[PDB]
Ligand binder design. Structure first.
Ligand SMILES: Nc1ccn([C@H]2C[C@H](O)[C@@H](COP(=O)(O)NP(=O)(O)OP(=O)(O)O)O2)c(=O)n1
Ligand SMILES: [Mg+2]
Ligand SMILES: [Mg+2]
Length: 347
DNA sequence: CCTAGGACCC
DNA sequence: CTGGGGTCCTAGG
C-alpha cells in the first residue's frame, strides 16, 4: 500500500459557479463582485476568471480599477447563497468517495488515500476531477503528496484544470530556488526577517542551523519552518467536523458616518445580526470585539470578555456599545465591525 | 488571566 | 483610492 494526501481546490470558484448559469461566457473575462456595477465606489473584485487575471485583475482590486484594466469584462454581482450551496454540493460528493476528507474553508479539501499497487494517485485524482465536473458543472485541480502542506504547494502547479505530484523525489529540485513565501504559512514579513538572516530561498532555509531559527522564531516555530522547507507537514487527514471559533460582520458605508447616533445604531445592528446567526447554529458567545476604521483608513479593534458565556441580546449589545464607546470617534467613520468569539468546550 | 495586534490565509 | 470573513500566536499589562 502507498499512503497519499490529495488536496482538491475549485478553479476560479465564484466565476465557475456563475458560468454554469452563463455558459456563453466560458472563455471570456468575467469579474464577480459588488452588485455587478463596475463604477460603484467602495467595492472590489471577489473573483476574476482566469481570462481577466491575464489583464492583471485579482481578488481585492477595486472594481473601477478592474474595469480600467479589463475593458472587455462582464461584471456579475456576488450571489453568496449560490456559492454556499455549490460549496456544500462539492464537499458532499467528495465525502462520498469513502476516503477521510478534511474540508478547509469554502472551496478546498484534503483527502487521505492508501492505494494498492494496481492503482496510481494520478488516476484517482483524475476520477475526482471527472466526478466533480459531471455532477456539479465545476472544475477543480488536485495536488498530490504525502503531507497536507506539500499537497497544497502541489495544487498551485496543478492549476488550472489539472493534477500535479510533488514528493521527496522532486521537492527540492522544484522548490529550492523559490522564495520562502512559497511555503504555506510563510508570508512577506517572515520572508523579510529571513532575508536579514541571509536566507532568501527554500533551499537556504532547509539547511539553516536550527539554533539560528529557534532563537529568532521560538523553539517550536523555528523547527516548524525547517520542516516546511524540507517539504514536510501534517500527515493526518481528519474527518472531524470543523467548529468555528468566531463569527463576524463588517460594513464599509457608502458614505462616512459623522453622527454618533448612526455609529451606535450600526454596531447594535451588527451585534444583533451576528448573535442571531450564532444562536441558530447552537453556539454561545465568550467575547465581543468591535472594529473601527476612520476616513483616513486608520483601523483598530478592541475586545471585551463577557463575565460568563451568554447569548443574551441586551448584554451583548450593551457590551458592543461600551466597547465602541472606548474609541475616540473624532474622525469620520468608514467602517464598523463586530466579531463574536464563541465557546469551544461542550457544543 | 486579560487585551492588543501582527501575520497570514480564503 | 483602498471588501468581507476567518485562524493562530505573541507581546506585555
Ligand atoms: N482575497 C480573497 C481571496 C478569495 N476569496 C473568495 C473568492 C474565491 O473564488 C474563493 C476561493 O479562494 P481561492 O481558492 O484562493 N481562489 P479561486 O478559487 O478564485 O481561484 P483558483 O483557486 O483557481 O486560483 O474565496 C475572497 O473573497 N477574497
Ligand atoms: Mg480555488
Ligand atoms: Mg482555495
Amino acid at each position: 500500500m502507498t499512503k497519499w494526501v490529495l488536496h482538491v481546490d475549485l478553479d476560479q470558484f465564484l466565476a465557475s459557479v456563475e458560468l454554469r448559469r452563463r455558459p456563453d461566457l466560458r472563455g471570456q473575462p468575467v469579474i464577480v463582485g459588488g452588485s455587478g456595477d463596475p463604477s460603484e465606489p467602495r467595492k472590489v473584485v471577489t473573483t476574476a476568471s482566469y481570462e481577466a487575471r491575464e489583464f492583471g485583475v485579482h481578488a481585492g482590486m477595486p472594481l473601477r480599477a478592474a474595469a480600467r484594466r479589463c475593458p472587455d469584462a462582464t461584471f456579475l454581482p456576488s450571489d453568496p447563497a449560490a456559492y454556499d450551496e455549490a460549496s456544500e454540493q462539492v464537499m458532499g460528493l467528495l465525502r462520498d468517495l469513502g476516503h477521510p476528507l478534511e474540508v478547509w474553508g469554502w472551496d478546498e479539501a484534503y483527502l487521505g488515500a492508501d492505494l494498492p499497487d494496481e492503482s496510481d494517485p494520478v488516476e484517482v485524482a483524475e476520477r475526482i476531477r471527472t466526478v466533480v465536473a459531471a455532477e456539479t458543472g465545476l472544475s477543480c485541480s488536485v495536488g498530490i503528496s504525502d503531507n497536507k502542506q506539500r499537497a497544497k504547494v502541489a495544487t498551485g502547479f496543478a492549476k488550472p484544470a489539472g493534477i500535479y505530484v510533488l514528493t521527496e523525489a522532486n521537492w527540492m529540485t522544484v522548490m529550492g530556488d523559490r522564495p520562502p513565501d512559497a511555503l504555506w504559512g510563510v508570508g512577506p514579513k517572515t520572508t523579510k526577517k529571513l532575508a536579514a538572516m541571509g536566507i532568501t530561498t527554500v533551499a537556504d532555509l532547509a539547511v539553516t542551523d536550527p539554533s539560528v531559527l529557534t532563537t529568532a522564531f521560538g523553539p517550536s516555530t523555528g523547527l516548524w519552518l525547517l520542516l516546511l522547507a524540507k517539504g514536510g507537514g501534517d500527515t493526518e487527514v481528519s474527518s472531524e467536523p470543523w467548529v468555528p471559533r468566531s463569527r463576524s460582520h463588517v460594513v464599509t458605508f457608502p458614505q462616512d458616518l459623522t453622527e454618533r447616533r448612526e455609529m451606535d445604531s450600526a454596531v447594535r445592528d451588527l451585534a444583533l445580526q451576528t448573535l442571531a446567526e450564532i444562536v441558530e447554529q447552537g453556539r454561545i458567545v465568550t467575547r465581543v470585539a468591535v472594529t473601527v476604521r476612520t476616513s483616513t483608513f486608520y483601523t483598530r479593534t478592541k475586545i471585551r470578555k463577557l463575565p460568563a458565556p451568554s447569548t443574551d441580546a441586551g448584554q451583548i449589545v450593551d457590551t458592543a456599545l461600551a466597547v465602541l464607546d472606548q474609541f475616540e470617534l473624532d474622525r469620520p467613520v468608514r467602517l464598523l465591525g463586530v466579531r463574536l468569539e464563541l465557546a469551544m468546550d461542550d457544543v
